[PDB]
Amino acid sequence: PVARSWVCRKTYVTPRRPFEKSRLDQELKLIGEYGLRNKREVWRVKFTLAKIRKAARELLTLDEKDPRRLFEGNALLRRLVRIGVLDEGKMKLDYILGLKIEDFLERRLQTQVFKLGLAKSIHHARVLIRQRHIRVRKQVVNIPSFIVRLDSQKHIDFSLRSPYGGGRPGRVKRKNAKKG
Amino acid sequence: GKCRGLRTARKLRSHRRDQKWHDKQYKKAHLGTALKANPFGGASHAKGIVLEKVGVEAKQPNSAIRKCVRVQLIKNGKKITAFVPNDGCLNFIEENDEVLVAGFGRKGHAVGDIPGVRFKVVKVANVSLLALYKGKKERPR
Amino acid sequence: TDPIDDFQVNWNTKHGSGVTRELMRELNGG
Amino acid sequence: MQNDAGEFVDLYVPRKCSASNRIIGAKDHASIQMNVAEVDKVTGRFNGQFKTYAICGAIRRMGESDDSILRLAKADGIVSKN
Amino acid sequence: VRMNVLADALKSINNAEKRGKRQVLIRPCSKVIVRFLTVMMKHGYIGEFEIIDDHRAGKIVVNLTGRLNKCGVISPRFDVQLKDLEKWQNNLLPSRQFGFIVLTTSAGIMDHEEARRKHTGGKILGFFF
Amino acid sequence: EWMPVTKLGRLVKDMKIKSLEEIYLFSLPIKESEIIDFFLGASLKDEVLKIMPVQKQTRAGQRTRFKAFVAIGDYNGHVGLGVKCSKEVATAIRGAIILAKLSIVPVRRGYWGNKIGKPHTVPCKVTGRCGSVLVRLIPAPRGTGIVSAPVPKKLLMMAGIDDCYTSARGCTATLGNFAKATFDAISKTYSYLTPDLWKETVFTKSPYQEFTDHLVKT
Amino acid sequence: GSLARAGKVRGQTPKVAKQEKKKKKTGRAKRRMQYNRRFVNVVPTFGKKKGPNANS
RNA sequence: CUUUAAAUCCUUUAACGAGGAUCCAUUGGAGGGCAAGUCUGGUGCCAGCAGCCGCGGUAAUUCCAGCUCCAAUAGCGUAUAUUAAAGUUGCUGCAGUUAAAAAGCUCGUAGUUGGAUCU
């Protein structure tokens, strides 16, 4: 007996066919266009979208006045609208099945700091996030996979201690100034 | 045809259970004769002592000498023949030294043009054959 | 070298699979 | 044919056999669409009108196109009762 | 010998409709056959039918309008709950847009949609589409 | 330049047939691939499914021909499959493209569930058969994609099916029978009588009757 | 049938030293380079759709 | 500093810390299945590769290497058990003329299944 917990799950699934040329092309397109590190990030987003589709499909089989369908579908649609993936006017379970993987990849903190103009590119965005140059609201966020919420979208700054934000120019600038 | 009655569950279940024994893989797994006959005895790997170096002739369409070793397993004292996979790797094996042998990849079936050989050497003298082949390690002295 | 020609000649040889792959590359994709 | 917004979403609406009420396929090249001329009530001449009958290839193959066209013409007033 | 007169009736209707015939004869008639036929007809799948009354067991002459793809029986009459109805629909019906599964429930013989409306289950008699 | 040989070709060349659906409605045979080139020639994409060598033994050696299986179709409801055997691979492919154009059939698309938007899947479950290969197409929810083997997937994507479940039985290793069976299953979509197709059919003048004098003066 | 020749070809293969080359990019940069090579560069293409390691 | 029973680890602060940023990514592959070289050198049915088909008997697209390429990536290969693939155990849902298969033929208890009909 221990006071520990052993709850853990995988956040991705590897594809059944390892060398499907079309799938390789689409996954590489996504990686390059969103500045991802590997295929596992694509598969992670694919898996969360797939589980959302599974939940929506399970709920759509139910009666339209089932309290469980109403409650859980409303919760799922609310969670989708809150993260900015689903439009607030498209608040029906059938619009969940129309969602695409690029809708979730557009809400990443990396994509958002590239779109907001804080970075010259998407790879610059990733290296800027991992280097503690970006804060969300008041909190410094280190994780490029941080899914930015709609209310949190408008507060993404350069952090109050970064050379690009507040003061204290970095180690290289200080060394250069000292050397002359 | 087959029976379709609401009270045929015993008939269907029993017929399926009897007919599953004509499945070769099911019978091999559930009869217990194959596990008894298996030199590894259900293990994935086994450690053994090299008795001699034996050269195995490749089957008729091909032509080569497959450099194998006869080994005696420590667990049960059974004598098997194990392929030494890569080239020059028979020079890494001496006589009367301990080798780790695994299956050859067909779950107890011979692989390729190597008759009656279903095992391959993985380690020799507690050093992997891959490390010795690539020069990453040397056999102990 | 035209892969259609290479497939026509060498499809039944040791390089039949390779010429088939090259022919399929040329036939569809551009 | 239709969706929730009400518009018709099919590419086209295929014909149905006038005898069997089965869809006539795009590649049913044995199916026919025969027009039988209407005849003026008093002079017995072609008045420019006709009645159309589509018969599928299967019905023609089983030999029943003749009786089916006869039945349709009789039910259409073209062929005299009795 | 013949069991399941409804199976015979449904197979006869299916075989006649596949030959493109306008009427089909069904013998023997029964209450279950008449109710299944009424369910088929209320959805426009067969048309009018006549019950010939002989003093032993009636016959039915069913007018066929060629809108029927398959009418079939499900033997045995598995008990179906309201949860299992979706799985049965997926198994049997060609689409979620059309096709019906006929059940015998304590509220009568009805299609699966009507059984969902009355919140009842029962035993599966057959299907038609 | 195209010189039509058939009545249908002459009617099509002179802009008397306004759509390919008018040809399908009357189920007229299309004996000229230039008709399809006229109607859809900007959106059709042909894919060589396979080149398969076939050998006939003779007095001295095997005479070898090459059979091209080619799938064609715009991705919006039209698809065809053509097989041509010839001495040279290039002419076999040319003939197979011609034959796939000639065999283009319409594809009926439906909805899995609620009917919002354009049709995305097969209207119902449809089975096609060719030489012990049975291919079953099942409606799928929107966004599923084609859950199938690569060979039927090519033809289903070319037919404008966005999402569909697939079952297959038999020797699907024979690519020709697999492709022909899925083409049959696709072409059976418009032959299936669904209750929305119960409305009585309003008969129209056939192209040969409507534009008769045009052909008479020719 | 003798074990005298057991490392023949590997023993008699002339030894060639590996050449020194700059390090390969790793992680996101390697994927960026692959994406750029396959979807932003078109000059290597000539219409034949040749492979990426073609030698003829 | 903080943490903690006391520590450690995270977190926080300061100092030093990157150019071949040498502060160097690997594991398996490149005939097909299956993504990616009938490029070069060696070997010459040998050595070996090869899950399978197959490769090697003097241009080896397959072995041993160099180069190049691709697959996943702080991971990747191998053995074995097992699941899906297997509608190759089939209740859903398989077969049984000729591919494996219907008892030589009847009777027959259990088992299974049983015609219409009562508002």
Strand-pair partners of E110? E103
> What token pair was written down for A4?
């520990």
C-alpha of D73 from chain center: 10
* CA–CA separation, F85 and F51 (whole Å): 9
A168 touches strand H (CB under 7 A): yes
* CA–CA separation, A119 and A157 (whole Å): 11
Q: Which residue has the tokens 């629909």?
A: E89
- Residue A55's Cβ-count burial label (10 Å; 0-12, 13-18, 19+) is middle
The parent domain of residue B33 ranges over 1-141
Question: Which residue in A21, A24, A25, A28 has the most chain G C-beta atoms within 10 A of its own C-beta, making it the best mutation to test that interface?
Answer: A28
* CA–CA separation, A147 and A155 (whole Å): 13
Cα radius of gyration (chain D): 16
Number of alpha carbons in the 13 Å side-chain half-sphere of residue D32: 12
Strand-pair partners of F56? F63
Neighbours of A167 (CB within 10 A): 8
Q: What is the DSSP letter of B118?
A: -
Contact E74, E93 (CB under 8 A): no
The shortest CB-CB distance from D4 to any of F21, F105, F116 is to: F116
Number of alpha carbons in the 13 Å side-chain half-sphere of residue E85: 25
- Residue D67's Cβ-count burial label (10 Å; 0-12, 13-18, 19+) is exposed
Using CA atoms of E51, E54, E56, E57 in order, give the dihedral in degrees to the nearest 10. -10
The DSSP element (H or E) to which C6 belongs, if any, is helix C3-10
* CA–CA separation, D72 and E16 (whole Å): 20
Nucleotide nearest to E91 (CA to C1'): H92
> What token pair was written down for G24?
């390969």
Sign, CA dihedral B109-B115-B121-B122, equals negative
Residue of F nearest to C11 (CA): F53
Cα radius of gyration (chain F): 19
1-56 on G, CB < 7 Å from strand H? 5-10, 12-24, 26-27, 30, 34, 37, 50-56
Kindly write down the DSSP assignment for every residue of E39-69, as one continuous string.
Answer: HHHHTTSS--EEEE--SSS-EEEEEP-S--S
Residues 6+ apart with CB under 8 A from E28: E5, E57, E58, E59
The residue lying closest to nucleotide H69, measuring its CA against C1', is: G53
Backbone angles phi, psi at E15, to 5 degrees: -65, -40
Q: How far are the Cα atoms of B5, B12, B22, B29, F83 from residue B16, in angstroms, in the given order? A: 16, 6, 10, 17, 45
* CA–CA separation, A55 and A52 (whole Å): 5
Which amino acid is residue B100, in one-letter code?
Answer: L
* CA–CA separation, A45 and A53 (whole Å): 12
Sign, CA dihedral B37-B41-B46-B51, equals negative
3-state secondary structure of F113: coil
CATH, residue E88: 3.30.1490.10
Helical pair C3-10 and C16-27, crossing angle rounded to 10 deg: 150
Q: What is the DSSP letter of G14?
A: P
Q: Which residue has the tokens 């020799």?
A: B124
* CA–CA separation, B75 and B38 (whole Å): 12
> Chain H positions under 7 Å from a protein CB?
12-14, 16-18, 20-22, 24-25, 28, 30-39, 41-43, 45-57, 60-74, 78-82, 87-96, 102, 111-118
* CA–CA separation, F142 and F164 (whole Å): 9
Contact A43, A63 (CB under 8 A): no
On whether both E51 and E104 belong to a single domain, the answer is: no
* CA–CA separation, A144 and A105 (whole Å): 11
Q: Which chains touch G (3 or more CB pairs under 8 A)?
A: A, B, C
Contact B66, B51 (CB under 8 A): no
Number of domains present in the structure of chain B: 1
The DSSP element (H or E) to which E25 belongs, if any, is strand E23-26
Domain boundary among E19, E41, E68: E68
Inter-chain touch C1–G56, beta carbons under 8 Å: yes
On whether both E35 and E75 belong to a single domain, the answer is: no
Q: Comparing C-alpha atoms, which of E68, E71, E80, E75 is closest to residue E104?
A: E80
On whether both E45 and E62 belong to a single domain, the answer is: yes
> What token pair was written down for E117?
């409306």
* CA–CA separation, E92 and E54 (whole Å): 35
Going along chain F from its start, the domains and CATH numbers come out as 1-106 (3.30.160.20), 107-200 (3.30.230.10)
Q: Comparing C-alpha atoms, which of D72, E39, E99 is closest to residue F192?
A: E99
Neighbours of A18 (CB within 10 A): 8
On whether both E82 and E35 belong to a single domain, the answer is: no
Q: How far are the Cα atoms of B99, F12, F18, F24, F107 from residue D13, in angstroms, in the given order? A: 75, 20, 16, 10, 12
Q: Does G38 touch chain C (CB under 8 A)?
A: no
Q: Does F37 touch chain C (CB under 8 A)?
A: no
On whether both E78 and E49 belong to a single domain, the answer is: no
Q: What approach was used to elucidate this structure?
A: cryo-EM
Domain boundary among E46, E68, E90: E68
Contact B121, B132 (CB under 8 A): no
Beta-sheet pairing, F164-169 with F146-147: parallel
* CA–CA separation, A17 and A91 (whole Å): 35
Å between CA of A153 and C1' of H40: 57
**Alpha helix stretches (DSSP H) within B38-138:** 129-134
On whether both E77 and E44 belong to a single domain, the answer is: no
C-alpha of F200 from chain center: 27
Question: Which residue in A94, A95, A101, A103 has the most chain F C-beta atoms within 10 A of its own C-beta, making it the best mutation to test that interface?
Answer: A94
Inter-chain touch G3–B88, beta carbons under 8 Å: no
Q: How far are the Cα atoms of F81, F178, F184, F189 from residue F170, in angstroms, in the given order? A: 20, 9, 15, 22
The DSSP element (H or E) to which F55 belongs, if any, is strand F47-57
On whether both E2 and E32 belong to a single domain, the answer is: yes
Contact F144, F165 (CB under 8 A): yes
Q: How far are the Cα atoms of D49, D55, E20, F30 from residue D34, in angstroms, in the given order? A: 13, 8, 20, 20
Å between CA of A65 and C1' of H25: 56
Residues 6+ apart with CB under 8 A from D56: D17, D19, D20, D22, D24, D28, D30, D31
The residue lying closest to nucleotide H30, measuring its CA against C1', is: G53
* CA–CA separation, E80 and E111 (whole Å): 12
Q: Does G2 touch chain B (CB under 8 A)?
A: yes
134-153 on A, CB < 7 Å from strand H? 140
Q: How far are the Cα atoms of F62, F150, F177, F187 from residue F68, in angstroms, in the given order? A: 19, 17, 13, 21
* CA–CA separation, B96 and B125 (whole Å): 10
The parent domain of residue E103 ranges over 69-129
CB < 8 Å from A in window 12-51 of G: 27-29, 31-32, 34-36, 38-39
Q: Which chains touch F (3 or more CB pairs under 8 A)?
A: A, C, D, E
On whether both E78 and E124 belong to a single domain, the answer is: yes
Backbone angles phi, psi at F67, to 5 degrees: -110, 120
Q: How far are the Cα atoms of E85, E95, E115, E124, F165 from residue E90, in angstroms, in the given order? A: 9, 8, 16, 14, 13
On whether both E33 and E86 belong to a single domain, the answer is: no
Sign, CA dihedral F39-F42-F47-F51, equals positive
Q: Comparing C-alpha atoms, which of A106, A109, A105 is closest to residue A127?
A: A109
Contact D23, D16 (CB under 8 A): yes
* CA–CA separation, A89 and A118 (whole Å): 30
Contact E64, E22 (CB under 8 A): yes
A154 touches strand H (CB under 7 A): no
* CA–CA separation, E77 and D70 (whole Å): 45
* CA–CA separation, F43 and B22 (whole Å): 55
Contact E26, E57 (CB under 8 A): no
Q: For this experimental structure, what is the resolution in angstroms?
A: 2.7
**Alpha helix stretches (DSSP H) within chain F:** 7-13, 20-25, 33-40, 89-102, 150-158, 175-187, 207-210, 212-217
On whether both E64 and E2 belong to a single domain, the answer is: yes
Cα radius of gyration (chain E): 14
> What token pair was written down for F126?
């449809």
Beta strand ranges found along chain A (DSSP E): 135-136, 139-140, 156-157
Per-residue b or e along B76-104, where b marks 16 or more CB atoms closer than 10 Å to that residue's CB:
eeeebbbbbebbbbbebbeeebebbbbbb
Backbone angles phi, psi at G54, to 5 degrees: -70, 140
Sign, CA dihedral B13-B15-B16-B17, equals positive
Number of alpha carbons in the 13 Å side-chain half-sphere of residue E91: 10
Å between CA of A141 and C1' of H11: 14
First and final CA of chain F: distance in angstroms?
A: 18
The DSSP element (H or E) to which D53 belongs, if any, is strand D46-55
3-state secondary structure of D12: coil
> What token pair was written down for F156?
């289903």
CATH, residue E51: 3.30.1370.30
* CA–CA separation, A60 and F40 (whole Å): 38
Residues 6+ apart with CB under 8 A from A171: none
Number of alpha carbons in the 13 Å side-chain half-sphere of residue B16: 7
Number of domains present in the structure of chain E: 2
Going along chain D from its start, the domains and CATH numbers come out as 1-82 (3.30.1230.20)
> What token pair was written down for A167?
């003061």
3-state secondary structure of A28: helix
Residue of G nearest to C29 (CA): G49
* CA–CA separation, G48 and C29 (whole Å): 8
